[PDB]
């Protein structure tokens, strides 16, 4: 849905690295492993936390708001 705040296994905060991760993938044309290493994700628990995330909230944001102010 949206990037988890912390890694499930160890508890490292990875919710502040999603935008940096996407920026590294897109702007710098780094492959996933090097981007994950650059962000500081060394244990493969954190690496799977960020690597396998599916950002469904974007799809949710396409529908018009139910209660629009």
């Amino acid at each position: 849905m949206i990037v988890p705040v912390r890694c499930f296994s160890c508890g490292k905060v990875v919710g502040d690295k999603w935008e940096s991760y996407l920026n590294l993938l897109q702007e710098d044309e780094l492959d996933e492993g090097t981007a994950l290493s650059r962000l500081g994700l060394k244990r493969y628990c954190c690496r799977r936390m960020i690597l396998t995330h599916v950002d469904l909230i974007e799809k949710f944001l396409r529908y018009n708001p139910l209660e629009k102010r």
Partner: protein, 1179 residues
């Protein structure tokens, strides 16, 4: 690449597959069948029959009115509109599916037909033939005859042409695939019904006791006619040792098995030699002639066509034909009931005689041990009726009902001389209600379960449901996975229950033909040299191939090779519809062509000589792959190159099970096409040592279905584990649709953080599994840690749960309408008051505001009222202690489920079709995993949580990593789930390197390479890690298998199963506890539980269970008659049995109330179960 005509590689075929799934989609068969039905089948149903002629004779007592009238009604073209809804106020507006779903409407569109009412008149002159003329009243005027429900995304739906942005605007998930109907706001899917094909001759050996040894039968049927089933059977009487072996045929509407020769002479073939030529095509086959002599000896007594016709007519079961007209009667039976699929016209007696000779020839071949009896399980002999044909036959019946009603109304009004009105003639409610009833409830009529509620638990669950086939349940073995099921249905996806094998799922690339008119192919055959059957004489053309089209022997050909070559060329260039299947059996010298609907087929690469390279090669080359890649990349300017382009240029072919008998398929191109130190880690493969291939598999992994395509490394698992995972992934919890927030579904479950698998297959990116995942990558350790994961239990990390592992949202929607019990007895949504309401529930009404609905945001618990409704009743009644005329309202509120609780997410208020207000209340709660919840890997390794440990108590590696899950080692060896271990290793490598593991089944990925990559990353090559005990910090003597693994949270949670009952509601009839946990019911103490208690010898406990725990009833009997007919006034202390006239010979007994009911039911059935309290005989 650089070379345009270079051969493709095994990696290139996925491009082809992508193109296929770009043009077809996952539910192509549903939409195709429905579009075929709407475009052509409706018009055929309307035009067939549906010309109501009523000839009102003059009935002239006097010649002054000797005029005979003839009123005819005919139906012209049929118009089907876009889906629209009526309204209480009468305004009609367009209806969209995400209004039908919310308002419980039916996504249906009106049907109109152009009715032409003609009237003819004739002068009624006796003797003179009547001549009818128009009166110039040629009135014509479309009329509404009902509503056809529309399947979503079909050609007649609003969403067919919608783009992604439009779908988002219309509140429709772009991932939704359609292929289902909306009936009363419920999504209904039509399961493909399997049946045996028609117009196919099948020969079967019979059992020893029966006097008939072999039976050759055809289930003849005609698509463009009345669609009636007439079963012809040709039977060979007498066992092998018997001497009088006579062949007899079973004609319809005949009470006896007529000998075959009598039929042949009736059709017009008098000489014995001509009959034998019609049956046996070889003079040298004297065995068949010897076996056939008894039949002609039997029919020697008839030597004339008229005589044989009379013989048949005498046997006629109608028994309403005079002696002279029996001939005509027999003729009629031979013209309109014998082999209907050939023709219903006359002058084709030769064709039917030839077909009968062919059936007898097949039967004799089976009896002469020259061929085996036909396999009933051969999948090419089966057909799948999809939404198209099912709705076709249902609508045919329903429209026949409506037109019969029209004719009856017209006859009644002309007899009674009343005026005629079309609006009072047509009752659109007939068609509308019939279709709505058939789709709303599974029963397909006026079979069961034909239409089912679409499964929306998970995206893959919906995909699997939309491709499901059911076989209604002979001497066959239908449950087995047949050889012919290869590439058409999933080898491992079927329920474990009674439906095992009967319920099947389509392969990924399998499609069902929708049927085409065979006339163009017949014209092609006639033009290309097919000799007509009428002037066919077998002796002058012995080695002639018999050409069949849809089971109709149309003629013979003398050069079948050229005919097959040109037919293949025509189909490959698109001149013949690709769905048409053409089989050439060289040994039997036959050529069959099938164009009918329901045939299941799959696509394959075409292989030709390719003289340039001097060896067989695929027709597809790198240039076509490049064009497909370019088109795909453009979609994500060049000429578009789609799957249809591959089809048209003769690059890929559609093959069904029947044609698949006559081809050779290469498993993979790169290894089997080219003419012929190996890695020991790779699996062993055989070159087949044969180079005559005609086709190549696009990819072997395409033999799997939707659910099996999710399994990582399915070829490294025991097959039952694959079946278990296929069944269990539909229960996986994920995100079923992206618009779940605007749907008021009854139940919905969502993961907080769905994750795509680290080990993923190539086929799952056509299933959108990476976009809508149904699981999470948990760090799993295989260890005997604490003994709390024995016998399939699991240890889950409590700290992982605290941080959001496998957490879920759960939505439940309660619906409530206000109904008109009378013209002014409307129900009212309100907040009922104890002062003036009856039977108000014990829950709190305080959370309702003044419209009778809780407002979103309020926390609700079990038994609290969420919808407040009252119904008016008749006042001025006094009872119950506190019932007065003020209590004119009876409570009809809806409380929240007893066990459930949560936050009211949303409430929706609207009006129904009738215009009455109704509401839907959706309540949201959070399911957090706990002890007893069920989780499973993708390999059938199901298990519940035994216990949860916090992070400090879990074992840890030198890097501080702790597992999310610990599973027992003992689950591995017996089950042989090697794929689980391989997927864990591959996931560890992928997580370390940042790539994605390619866990496709039949790739050349070995554990050796994964181990080498893992070693390069700095870990032990086999996945073992030195772990430390959490409690003491000491090194564990054994190293632990450790790594990420994809797990699904299943729908079975312990909080939805826990249930206990001390005392509660009792059933009204038997005074026993009610059934079900939703009703606070009691547990069944079955028969064999009683048997176990008997074996234990605990009699008092058994009595206590059956009497004090369920139903103990004290009843009175008298000592004279053992009946319970004792009037007992306990307060007055007066007992009396009328009849016996006694008042002191009474006893009371404690018996189960079910026993008292049984004795009373025996008495009501005229039996006296007299009960006596003392012995009258010695033991």
């Amino acid at each position: 690449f650089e070379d345009e005509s270079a051969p493709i590689t095994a990696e290139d075929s996925w491009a082809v597959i992508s193109a296929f799934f770009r043009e077809k989609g996952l539910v192509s068969q549903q939409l195709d069948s429905f579009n075929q039905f709407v475009d052509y089948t409706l018009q055929d149903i309307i035009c067939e029959d549906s010309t109501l002629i009523l000839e009102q004779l003059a009935q002239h007592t006097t010649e002054s009115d000797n005029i005979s009238r003839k009123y005819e009604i005919s139906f012209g073209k049929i118009y089907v509109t876009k889906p629209m809804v009526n309204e209480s106020d009468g305004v009609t507006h367009a209806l969209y599916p995400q209004e039908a779903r919310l308002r419980n409407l039916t996504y249906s569109s009106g049907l109109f037909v152009d009715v032409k009412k003609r009237t003819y008149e004739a002068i009624d002159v006796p003797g003179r033939e009547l001549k009818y003329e128009l009166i110039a009243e040629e009135s014509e005027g479309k009329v509404f005859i009902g509503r056809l429900p529309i399947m979503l995304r079909s050609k007649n739906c609003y969403l067919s042409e919608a783009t992604e942005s439009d779908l988002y605007k219309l509140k429709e998930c772009p991932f939704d695939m359609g292929g289902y109907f909306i009936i009363n706001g419920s999504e209904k899917v039509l399961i493909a019904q399997e049946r045996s094909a028609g117009n196919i001759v099948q020969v079967f050996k019979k059992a020893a006791p029966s006097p008939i040894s072999h039976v050759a039968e055809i289930r003849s049927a005609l698509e463009k006619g009345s669609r009636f089933i007439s079963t012809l059977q040709v039977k060979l009487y007498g066992r092998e040792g018997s001497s009088a072996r006579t062949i007899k045929a079973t004609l319809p509407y005949i009470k006896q098995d007529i000998p075959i020769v009598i039929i042949f002479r009736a059709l017009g073939i008098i000489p014995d030699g001509e009959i034998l030529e019609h049956i046996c095509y070889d003079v040298n086959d004297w065995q068949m002639l010897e076996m056939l002599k008894p039949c002609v000896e039997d029919g020697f007594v008839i030597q004339d066509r008229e005589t044989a016709l009379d013989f048949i007519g005498r046997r006629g079961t109608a028994l309403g034909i005079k002696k002279e007209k029996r001939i005509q009667y027999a003729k009629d039976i031979l013209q309109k009931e014998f082999l209907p699929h050939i023709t219903q016209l006359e002058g084709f007696e030769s064709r039917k005689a030839f077909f009968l000779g062919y059936m007898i020839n097949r039967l004799l071949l089976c009896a002469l041990d020259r061929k085996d009896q036909d396999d009933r399980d051969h999948f090419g002999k089966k057909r799948l009726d999809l939404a198209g044909p099912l709705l076709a036959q249902l609508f045919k019946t329903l429209f026949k009902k409506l037109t019969k009603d029209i004719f009856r109304y017209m006859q009644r009004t002309v007899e009674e001389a009343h005026d005629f009105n079309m609006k009072l003639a047509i009752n659109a409610k007939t068609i509308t209600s019939g279709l709505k009833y058939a789709l709303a409830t599974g029963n397909w009529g006026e079979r069961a379960g034909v239409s089912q509620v679409l499964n929306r638990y998970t995206y893959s669950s919906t995909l699997s449901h939309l491709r499901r086939t059911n076989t209604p349940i002979k001497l066959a073995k239908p449950r087995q996975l047949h050889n012919t099921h290869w590439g058409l249905v999933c080898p491992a996806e079927t329920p474990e229950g009674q439906a095992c094998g009967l319920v099947k799922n389509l392969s990924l690339m399998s499609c069902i033909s929708v049927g085409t008119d065979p006339m163009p192919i017949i014209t092609f055959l006639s033009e290309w040299g097919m000799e007509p059957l009428e002037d066919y004489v077998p002796h002058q053309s012995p080695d002639a191939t018999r050409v069949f089209v849809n089971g109709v022997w149309h003629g013979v050909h003398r050069n079948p090779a050229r005919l097959m070559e040109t037919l293949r060329t025509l189909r490959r260039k698109g001149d013949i519809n690709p769905e048409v299947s053409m089989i050439r059996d060289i040994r039997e010298k036959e050529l069959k062509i099938f164009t009918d609907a329901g045939r299941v087929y799959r696509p394959l690469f075409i292989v030709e000589d390719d003289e340039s390279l001097g060896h067989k090669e695929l027709k597809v080359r790198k240039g076509h792959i490049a064009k497909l890649m370019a088109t795909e990349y453009q979609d994500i300017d060049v000429e578009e190159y789609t799957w249809s382009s591959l089809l048209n240029e003769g690059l890929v072919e559609y093959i069904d099970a029947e044609e698949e008998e006559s081809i050779l398929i290469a498993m993979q191109p790169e290894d089997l096409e080219p003419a012929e130190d190996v890695d020991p880690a790779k699996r062993i493969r055989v070159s087949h040592h044969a180079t005559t291939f005609t086709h190549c598999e696009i990819h072997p992994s395409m033999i799997l279905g939707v659910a099996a395509s999710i399994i990582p490394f399915p070829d490294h698992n025991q097959s039952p584990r694959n079946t278990y995972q296929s069944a269990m992934g539909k229960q996986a919890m994920g995100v079923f649709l992206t618009n779940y927030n605007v749907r008021m579904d009854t139940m919905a479950n969502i993961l907080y953080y769905p994750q795509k698998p680290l080990g993923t297959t190539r086929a799952m990116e056509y299933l959108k599994f990476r976009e809508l995942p149904a699981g999470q990558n948990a760090i799993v350790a295989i260890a005997c840690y604490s003994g709390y994961n024995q016998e399939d239990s699991m240890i889950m990390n409590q700290s992982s749960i605290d941080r959001g592992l496998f957490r879920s949202l759960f939505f439940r929607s309660y619906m409530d309408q206000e109904k008109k019990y009378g013209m002014s007895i409307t129900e009212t949504f309100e907040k009922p008051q104890r002062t003036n309401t009856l039977r108000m529930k014990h829950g709190t009404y305080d959370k309702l505001d003044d419209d009778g609905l809780i407002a979103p945001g309020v926390r609700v618990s079990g038994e609290d009222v969420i919808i407040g409704k009252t119904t008016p009743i008749s006042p001025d009644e006094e009872e119950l202690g506190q019932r007065t005329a003020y209590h004119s309202k009876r409570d009809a509120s809806t409380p929240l489920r007893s066990t459930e609780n949560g936050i009211v997410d949303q409430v929706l208020v609207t009006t129904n079709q009738d215009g009455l207000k109704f509401v839907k209340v959706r309540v949201r709660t959070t399911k957090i995993p706990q002890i007893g919840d069920k989780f499973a890997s993708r390999h059938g390794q199901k298990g519940t949580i035994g216990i949860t440990y916090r992070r400090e108590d879990m074992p840890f590696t030198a890097e501080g990593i702790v597992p999310d899950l610990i599973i027992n080692p003992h689950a591995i060896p017996s089950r042989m789930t090697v794929a689980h271990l391989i997927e864990c290793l591959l996931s560890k490598v992928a997580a370390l390197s940042g790539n994605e593991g390619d866990a496709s089944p039949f790739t050349d990925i070995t554990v050796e390479g994964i181990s080498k990559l893992l070693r390069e990353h700095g870990y032990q090559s086999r996945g073992f890690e030195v772990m430390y005990n959490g409690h003491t910090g000491k090194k564990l003597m054994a190293q632990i298998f450790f790594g990420p693994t994809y797990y699904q949270r299943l729908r079975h949670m312990v909080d939805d199963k826990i249930h206990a009952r001390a005392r509660g509601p009792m059933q009204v009839l038997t005074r026993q506890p009610v059934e079900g946990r939703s009703r606070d019911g009691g547990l069944r103490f079955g028969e064999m539980e009683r048997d176990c208690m008997i074996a234990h010898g605990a009699a008092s406990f058994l009595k206590e269970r059956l009497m004090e725990a369920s139903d103990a009833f004290r009843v009175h009997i008298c000592g004279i008659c053992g009946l319970m007919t004792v009037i007992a006034k306990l307060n007055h202390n007066q007992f009396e049995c009328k009849g016996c006239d006694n008042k002191i010979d009474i006893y009371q007994i404690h018996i189960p109330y079910a026993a008292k009911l049984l004795f009373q039911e025996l008495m009501a059935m005229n039996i006296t179960p007299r009960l006596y309290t003392d012995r009258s005989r010695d033991f």
